[PDB]
Design a protein around this ligand. Structure first.
Ligand SMILES: Nc1ncnc2c1ncn2[C@@H]1O[C@H](CSCC[C@H](N)C(=O)O)[C@@H](O)[C@H]1O
Ligand SMILES: O=c1[nH]cnc2c(O)cc(Br)cc12
Ligand SMILES: [Mg+2]
Length: 214
């Protein structure tokens, strides 16, 4: 029994099938109250929703799927015809993500790629019929943000206007990626300040009153 399985089960037992909003809400409740988990979460998710509504992307690539929270969040806003491709290195997570999408009724819009992004990115055009990407959600591991950006560029997957959206640029932080994109004439950057997901961290005091020795 893993934390990721407990999340899926919680969703299966509490969310309305075919209702992506109820799916997102069940995950957020479990991870707020029961177990912290690295889903993008609702505060940042609202920002993502606003950005997606702005750009109405037809083809989105996610780096890092986890339990499928952000894939559900994004795919529920996609127009008919539009596709999300999500890359996930951990097979247990790729399976959980698939079941989450199934439950939400979003499986037809989303394709899960099993593997490391750095290995999968060069396979995109040939194996998944991709010309250029309209949007990229970076949310896998901090050290890969900058090299995967350079790989997307090398492989011709970026066009003028492609929107990169990166999570966690402050915590855990992606200083190299930020420096690079902010300093590069190839990228126009905007920062959206928010809060790390699920940070009502429970702690307590113990009072222990000495009664004497035995
Ligand atoms: N190089 C890589 N390629 C693909 N997936 C990776 C990777 N490095 C880490 N990951 C995966 O990236 C994920 C980070 S957590 C993803 C959270 C998700 N976007 C959400 O908001 O719901 C983990 O599942 C991890 O296994
Ligand atoms: O490693 C992570 N990958 C993707 N997202 C993350 C997050 O949102 C918070 C923390 Br802490 C870690 C990660
Ligand atoms: Mg994140």
């Amino acid at each position: 029994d893993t934390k990721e399985q407990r999340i899926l089960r919680y969703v299966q037992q509490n969310a309305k099938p075919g209702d992506p909003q109820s799916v997102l809400e069940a995950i957020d409740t479990y991870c707020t109250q029961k177990e912290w988990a690295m889903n993008v979460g609702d505060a940042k998710g609202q920002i993502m929703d606003a950005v997606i509504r702005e750009y109405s992307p037809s083809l989105v690539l996610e780096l890092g799927a986890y339990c499928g929270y952000s894939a559900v969040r994004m795919a529920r806003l996609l127009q008919p015809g539009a596709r999300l491709l999500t890359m996930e290195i951990n097979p247990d997570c790729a399976a959980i993500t698939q079941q989450m999408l199934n439950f939400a009724g979003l499986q037809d819009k989303v394709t899960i790629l099993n593997g490391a992004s750095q290995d999968l990115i060069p396979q995109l055009k040939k194996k998944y019929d991709v010309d250029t990407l309209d949007m990229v959600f970076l949310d896998h591991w901090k050290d890969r943000y900058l090299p995967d950006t350079l790989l997307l560029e090398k492989c011709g997957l970026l066009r003028k206007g492609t929107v990169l959206l990166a999570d966690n640029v402050i915590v855990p932080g992606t200083p190299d990626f930020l420096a690079y994109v902010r300093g590069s004439s190839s990228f126009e950057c905007t920062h959206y300040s928010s809060y790390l997901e699920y940070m009502k961290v429970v702690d307590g005091l113990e009072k222990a009153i000495y009664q004497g020795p035995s």
